[PDB]
Paper text:
The signalling receptor gp130 represents a paradigm for differential signal activation and functional diversity. It is required for interleukin (IL)−6, IL-11, IL-27, oncostatin-M (OSM), leukaemia inhibitory factor (LIF), ciliary neurotrophic factor (CNF), cardiotrophin-1 (CT-1), and cardiotrophin-like cytokine factor-1 (CLCF1) signalling. For IL-6 and IL-11 cytokines, gp130 signals by homodimerization of its intracellular domains. Similar to IL-6, IL-11 coordinates gp130 homodimers by forming a hexameric signalling complex comprised of two molecules each of gp130, IL-11 and co-receptor, IL-11Rα.
Complexes comprised two copies of the human IL-11 cytokine variant (IL-11 fused to domains D2 and D3 of IL-11Rα) and two copies of murine gp130P496L mutant (D1-D6), in agreement with a human IL-11 complex which came into press after submission of our manuscript. IL-11 is a helical cytokine that coordinates a hexameric assembly with two copies of IL-11, IL-11Rα and gp130 through interactions at three principal binding sites. In our complex IL-11 residues T77-L90 are at an interface with IL-11Rα and adopt a helical conformation. A comparison with the crystal structure of apo IL-11 shows that these residues undergo a conformational change upon complex formation. We observe that for the IL-11 complex, the sidechain of IL-11:R135 at Site 2a inserts into a hydrophobic groove created by a hinge between domains D2 and D3 of gp130 (V190, W164, F169, Y184, I192, murine numbering). Here, IL-11Rα:R235 forms a salt bridge with gp130:E273.
Author numbering:
A (entry chain B), B (entry chain E): 112 to 154, 164 to 317
C (entry chain C), D (entry chain F): 25 to 607
E (entry chain D), F (entry chain A): 35 to 199
Amino acid sequence: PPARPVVSCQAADYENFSCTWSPSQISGLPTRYLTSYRKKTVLSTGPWPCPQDPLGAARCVVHGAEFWSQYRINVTEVNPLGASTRLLDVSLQSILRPDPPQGLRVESVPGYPRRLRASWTYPASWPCQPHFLLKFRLQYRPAQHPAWSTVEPAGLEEVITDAVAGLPHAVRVSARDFLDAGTWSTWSPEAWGTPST
Amino acid sequence: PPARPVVSCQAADYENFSCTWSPSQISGLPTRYLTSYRKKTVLSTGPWPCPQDPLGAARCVVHGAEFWSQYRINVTEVNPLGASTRLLDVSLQSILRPDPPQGLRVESVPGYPRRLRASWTYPASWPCQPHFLLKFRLQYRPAQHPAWSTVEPAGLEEVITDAVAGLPHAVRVSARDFLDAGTWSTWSPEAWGTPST
Amino acid sequence: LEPCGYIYPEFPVVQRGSNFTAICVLKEACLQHYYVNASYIVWKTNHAAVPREQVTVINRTTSSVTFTDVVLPSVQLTCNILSFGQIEQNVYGVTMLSGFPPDKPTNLTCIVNEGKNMLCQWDPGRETYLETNYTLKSEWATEKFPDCQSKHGTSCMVSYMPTYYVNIEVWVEAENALGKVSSESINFDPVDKVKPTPPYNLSVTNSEELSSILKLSWVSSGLGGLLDLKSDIQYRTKDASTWIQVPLEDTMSPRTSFTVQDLKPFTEYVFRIRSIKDSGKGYWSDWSEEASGTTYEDRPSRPPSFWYKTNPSHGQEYRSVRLIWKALPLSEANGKILDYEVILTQSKSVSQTYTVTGTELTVNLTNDRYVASLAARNKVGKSAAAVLTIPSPHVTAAYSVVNLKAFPKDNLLWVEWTPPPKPVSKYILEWCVLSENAPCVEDWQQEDATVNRTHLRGRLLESKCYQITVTLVFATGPGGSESLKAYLKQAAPARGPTVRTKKVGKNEAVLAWDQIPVDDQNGFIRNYSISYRTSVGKEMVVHVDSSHTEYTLSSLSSDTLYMVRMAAYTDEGGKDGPEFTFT
Amino acid sequence: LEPCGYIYPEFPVVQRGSNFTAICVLKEACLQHYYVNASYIVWKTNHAAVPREQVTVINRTTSSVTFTDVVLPSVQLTCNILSFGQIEQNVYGVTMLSGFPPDKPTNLTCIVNEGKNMLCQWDPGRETYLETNYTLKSEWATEKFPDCQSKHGTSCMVSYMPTYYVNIEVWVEAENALGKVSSESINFDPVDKVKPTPPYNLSVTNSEELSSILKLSWVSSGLGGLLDLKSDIQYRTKDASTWIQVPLEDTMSPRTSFTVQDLKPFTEYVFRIRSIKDSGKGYWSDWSEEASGTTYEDRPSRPPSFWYKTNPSHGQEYRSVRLIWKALPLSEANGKILDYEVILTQSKSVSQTYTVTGTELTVNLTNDRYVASLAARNKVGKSAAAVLTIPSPHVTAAYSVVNLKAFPKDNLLWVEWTPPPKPVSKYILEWCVLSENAPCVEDWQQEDATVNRTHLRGRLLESKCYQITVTLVFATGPGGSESLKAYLKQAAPARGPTVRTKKVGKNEAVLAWDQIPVDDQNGFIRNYSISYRTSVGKEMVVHVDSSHTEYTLSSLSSDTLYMVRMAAYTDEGGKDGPEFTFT
Amino acid sequence: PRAELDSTVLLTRSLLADTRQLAAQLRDKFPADGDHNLDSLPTLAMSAGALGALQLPGVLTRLRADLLSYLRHVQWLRRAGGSSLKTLEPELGTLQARLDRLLRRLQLLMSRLALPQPPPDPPAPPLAPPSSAWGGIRAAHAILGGLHLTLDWAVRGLLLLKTRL
Amino acid sequence: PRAELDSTVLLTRSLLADTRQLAAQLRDKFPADGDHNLDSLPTLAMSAGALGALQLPGVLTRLRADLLSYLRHVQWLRRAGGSSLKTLEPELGTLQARLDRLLRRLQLLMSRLALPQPPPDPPAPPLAPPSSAWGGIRAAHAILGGLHLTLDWAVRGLLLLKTRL
Ligand SMILES: *[C@@H]1O[C@H](CO)[C@@H](O[C@@H]2O[C@H](CO)[C@@H](O)[C@H](O)[C@H]2NC(C)=O)[C@H](O)[C@H]1NC(C)=O
Ligand SMILES: *[C@@H]1O[C@H](CO)[C@@H](O[C@@H]2O[C@H](CO)[C@@H](O)[C@H](O)[C@H]2NC(C)=O)[C@H](O)[C@H]1NC(C)=O
Ligand SMILES: *[C@@H]1O[C@H](CO)[C@@H](O[C@@H]2O[C@H](CO)[C@@H](O)[C@H](O)[C@H]2NC(C)=O)[C@H](O)[C@H]1NC(C)=O
Ligand SMILES: *[C@@H]1O[C@H](CO)[C@@H](O[C@@H]2O[C@H](CO)[C@@H](O)[C@H](O)[C@H]2NC(C)=O)[C@H](O)[C@H]1NC(C)=O
Ligand SMILES: *[C@@H]1O[C@H](CO)[C@@H](O)[C@H](O)[C@H]1NC(C)=O
Ligand SMILES: *[C@@H]1O[C@H](CO)[C@@H](O)[C@H](O)[C@H]1NC(C)=O
Ligand SMILES: *[C@@H]1O[C@H](CO)[C@@H](O)[C@H](O)[C@H]1NC(C)=O
């Protein structure tokens, strides 16, 4: 019989999540994947076939997922050796992980040689509705000095008040749901900015 | 009119008390004293004529007085100028004052040059029934040194454990009802005793 | 027979300093039973009988006491009767109270110690002399909180949890028997009043890259980051008590770390911090504990003072050169001086290299000209190299200082000289105590080419003669060394001069004396006084300049015993020598 | 669908180190709903999954876990099922407790701190690892008192007032889930167990009549004298730490004052006291605070040391006699020395009297014989009178000490002499530092007639030469004064000798030297070594006894430069002098 | 029962002393002059010579009756006298609780003597509350003085008894 | 009412955070795995996109109903769950009292908005006590998780509202 397939789900946004799967070990035979999910309650809701990518890839997108609700995924390999089912419990509120913020810029502050202005934008994947704001966390350090100073700015802009005069500082940011749903995004790429004279 | 006569009462023992009186100022006329007492209650008991001394002295003895009870004395001078009454409230339990203890002796303690044995006897006026014991207080000091060390011995005998070797110590005693009724007697005369070699 | 009477009023609360009337009324039955009328009423303030302030005209059964300026706060006033005119019977008694109605409490202020109930305090006002139940009322738009009652009347800690984010209204109600008064209500959100606990686990780290920089870090409770807290950071050099303050505008936003800059390259610093709500509402926290850290060491900024000495080794192809240097001060070491590297270059030949941990290096150089080089190496790297051209012994110095002087000033032995017309590279000065019992133990210091006057940097001794030496150092090597003698400070000589006769004549005597040893001259000998007398004649005195070593007494009496005394004087006085006698 | 199952037993209390079996039984409905059988049960000790210690053969619906040596005191054991073989669903969980049943508490002891509730304490025994409600039960013949429950299990203070004079019975009941055990009941009257508070307002008074005696006094609470308290009194000289104890049998009865005797006549003492029930039941109180007092001063026991000195006043009818005495030590002053009374009796004439507060009196006596008298007066009275016959100047001393010696021992300069055949009244010894730059400043001490050897009582200096003088004092006056020289301790000379040639010959040279000044000789000069050498010859050495002042070098080479060095040696080594040269 | 007798003696002495202290305290903070008496208090009306002639039953009966009625009056004070009495607390309650302790001790002693156990006297009618705080203080004086005399008599009589046994 | 809205927001954020902490604490001292749900708890069953479309009456009605039923379940836990829950005290009672504070704040907000005041719903039937301490813990998990989600929804919806007003 086929081994239990490995299944993982991730949510880039507060309203869709995707699940991908692969075999533990290849059976070596023509193998179909039957994939389904159902809402979980106490003791509609029934199983819906998830829409597999028309490309035939091993992926489903659950469009319009219930945010405060648990879903049970049902990936079933079926082949002449008999079925093998992976069951996975998923809730967006926990699997959610925002994309990194985009367009990090660092600008010198005129007349403040010890200050830098950092600014960025919401990730395009996140429509940033006022009820689904992100909270951002920002790290800055001199180029060579590896220790990251960490701040948690409010909004898309922060003034670093202690930038070492004339040393290029690398800056990076991570995002989370403002209610601390899900988990912090991966850090953005580092951006370089030099304090003003 | 005659002024209010002065009256005072004293009790040598737990069962008799005596009262004596004298004029504030002599009227200068033949003056009789009418003297009476009555028991006090709430709102027999009536007035009894106290037995004046057959000598005609200004004294009455209330024989067999109630110990835990208040009496009101009524001394009345009567003469052609009209009567004048002194009323006095008396209770033995408070006016009682034992006579000084009699026969204070101080003896050297053989083989204890720093110790003296003091002994005395109940005053003869006090029949020392087991329910009417006295408590005695004793004072001792070297002849010339005026400061009195004070002790409250139990019973008729005390060993002074700190007598200065070879200095004559004066000793004196005072008595009170063992329940601290009444007041301490006057101190006995001083007795002289020399510690042993 | 019921209580003989009653006093009216029963519970008199008297406004302090006002008058008060009490009346005692006896029941007819008490009168006829005790055979008295109200004239026999006796008033006592506690034990103290009222000295017939009372008046009894009111009627047969009634007596009144009047008090003026009732001062005692609590008086057990009792109405007694002299029963039968003799036995004082108590009728009634009332605790006369006196005091003031409470002042309206002002300055009602509350503070929420982080993690504690809301504390509010007020000015009580004047002393009331009466028990006052100061009640801290509190409510908000839907409910009244439990009343907090002050034990001592100056503060109350409520029982209920601080109701953050709600506009409570609170006021103090003060009540006593004389009157009840309520403070102004204050309408406030307690959140604005919280005092944060000081930051904790304060820590510092240095930058190995950046000596000048220390990184502060701390943990702020922030009520679980409930409060965005800004902070005020002060720091000082460990020795300096004066707290420097970080520009307060730089800490205006929530942060856990701050990078202090422009610190001394190797110095220990002490830091402290306190925090407040970002908006600056409420009250600054207490200061944290102090934290300390050391700026990472740095390349030493200046080369050590470098000099050489040679013992005269005439007739040898090799000369023992004692190279000597003085350790860099911390402000120049900027770190742990690990070793000194000495490089010796024989002109064009291979340069010798030596590593020395001590402050001196003895090397048997040839009589050739050498170039010495000295650098100080710490953890980070070598300092700039001091350079010292060791001339060949036969090279005569071409130029020396001129107009060299030395003088004490400000308790310091200063030395001044005129620079040569040639460009000096550096000046080296050397000095030693002059002594007849001990050798010239030399000490030395380096001065920059621009220096033309300096004080001798050392533990110079008062009343000790120092020889001073100045040697110019050119690129070609040392110039000619001029020397002079000076004192840091003078004193009277330790011993006077010893007088001896060189010649005696019929009317003259040539006195002679040996100069006081320099170990005993505590200063510059300016002159000597010679005093001499006969057994009866007046003592004559002669002053002799210190340059002289002999003097001829003249016009002496023949066949006469003369006694001679001699004293030597400095700028600080002189010392008599032993008496001498001659015939 | 009810809870999928239940674990049996639910509240397992496991005797520590024993084995335990838990069983998890699933309801058929849970099985058929989740499509599992008991094989899918997964056991977790908190987070830690049990590594299949469990066995499931029991039946389709039942799984059992067996633990060996259950050690953790509290384990949240939970029964889970791998729903569909994938999703672990919790079924049930039980807090597995393990521990020991309580030890029976031993050493149940109670103490009644005066004015506090009865405190009782016990040994808890081994650690039980379980909460144990140690209950202090108490009762007497008619009623049971409120149960006191220990917070920490080692002591409980009951709430009820100590029920004096009643035999209470009390016991500790220890309870935990494993078992309940009761201590032995102790049957006791609390009154016997009271610890009295220490005495307070401790005070001391001295007897002006009786220096040797101090009177202690104290206030004892005695629960209002409820307890007849005896006391234990300790005292010490203020300097001595060792507490002396008053004979305990003397304080065996209730008292408030005790007369300490045989105290030093003028000395400060410290006292402390503690009290216990007269019967000695219960426990000694803590010590009082220390109290201090000074024995009243007394007549000084011994006359001061008395001596006289006269400057030679030849040719005057009057002689200035400097009478001098040394203050009595406290052990002899026994009090405040107010003044000294000096009486001078000119034989049969009227005796002069003087009162002097200083330690010296200068009086211009005639050349007649005088009798001096000295007494020390304190508050109480004059000491015995010292007597000192001042002889007339012409009276020659008839007898002096013989065989006088002095030697240092034990770092002390001792002096010994043979008594004269006549009865000495007292010995006076005098000494001064010998110096060439300063006068003989004398110091002195008195010795009794019986003393024939004594140490010099003074701050003698090492390496300093002292002249020593001994003068016998007879009733007729002082005898002849013998003198000698000695050192307390020696050292090498501060300077070596200075060598000078007296004569030089073809093969000889008479060296001469001046003895080192006594201010520079740090000891007895025993000998000198003379060393001399040519520019190339071997250095010869000659030893010369210190008595000599000159030596003739012999067998010298002619026409040869000789260098000479000379050193002087004490018992502690020697010092080289300056080198000298001659041809 | 001699240990019972000396124990009871010492307990009554302690109670006597405390009563004395409290009485003095009251007298000094609330000076009240002359006779304050309650008609409902028991009266001692026997000679010193009569005490010496009594026999165990009458002695112990009177003692119990007296002390018990005083316990009732004390409780009545503490409840009803109002504010003022707190000035004398905890001393009052201490008095009362030692007094009930002493009554238990006396009952036990009677049991040990195997005397006829005291009658079950029906409870006294409830004392009319004091007219006023002043009347309460008056009550305080009267009660405490009567208790003092009661305990003096008690002590002396119990000592007398002890010489019989 | 904007000061009412931001005040309510901040109070609900505080309550959310505390709830989170308590939930974590429980999860860590009483690890319990899988789904612990009570059928009597309210269910959130609306999309992220649907929240954005709601209108004040339905929003605030649901919020009040949800929070109030949770208040009932919390009280039921604290009374009935027995011993175990004290492990989480005072935190539970704090939760509850802030929750009743928040319900009052919401009622007042509804008054300020002059919306139709919520119906006087008759009280829910009393919750059957938990079968056992274990069932109590299970209840604890279910309740606290549902409260957490409830307050997340609450916060987000109130913020949505604020942009409308
Ligand atoms: C997961 O999905 C698989 C198929 O996608 C389900 O397996 C089917 O279950 C039904 C109902 O029991 C049977 O009639 C079919 O024959 C099964 N098909 C296969 C290929 O096994 C499975 O039951 C689902 N599991 C869950 C928990 O939903
Ligand atoms: C989540 O899935 C929904 C459902 O498909 C997406 O909504 C569509 O997004 C596409 C791509 O931008 C638009 O062209 C459509 O108009 C959207 N609506 C519909 C009904 O198809 C949505 O973009 C996905 N992502 C997010 C972040 O919501
Ligand atoms: C005190 O005693 C005197 C007489 O000893 C009493 O005075 C008598 O009182 C009665 C009754 O009132 C009268 O009939 C008499 O005429 C009175 N005699 C005199 C001489 O005055 C007096 O009443 C007594 N007082 C008390 C308080 O007992
Ligand atoms: C107290 O008074 C009584 C009554 O008089 C006295 O008792 C008499 O005392 C005398 C003198 O000693 C005896 O002769 C009598 O026998 C006693 N009894 C009677 C009935 O008279 C008693 O002495 C007085 N003093 C004391 C201390 O009791
Ligand atoms: C006495 O005077 C008082 C005070 O005015 C009054 O209350 C009382 O009634 C008067 N009594 C008589 C009998 O007039
Ligand atoms: C009270 O009585 C005395 C003496 O009997 C009398 O002088 C006085 O006038 C009386 N007072 C009144 C107010 O009746
Ligand atoms: C449980 O089910 C598995 C798989 O269906 C089976 O192998 C096993 O024997 C079953 N166990 C019992 C006890 O029935």
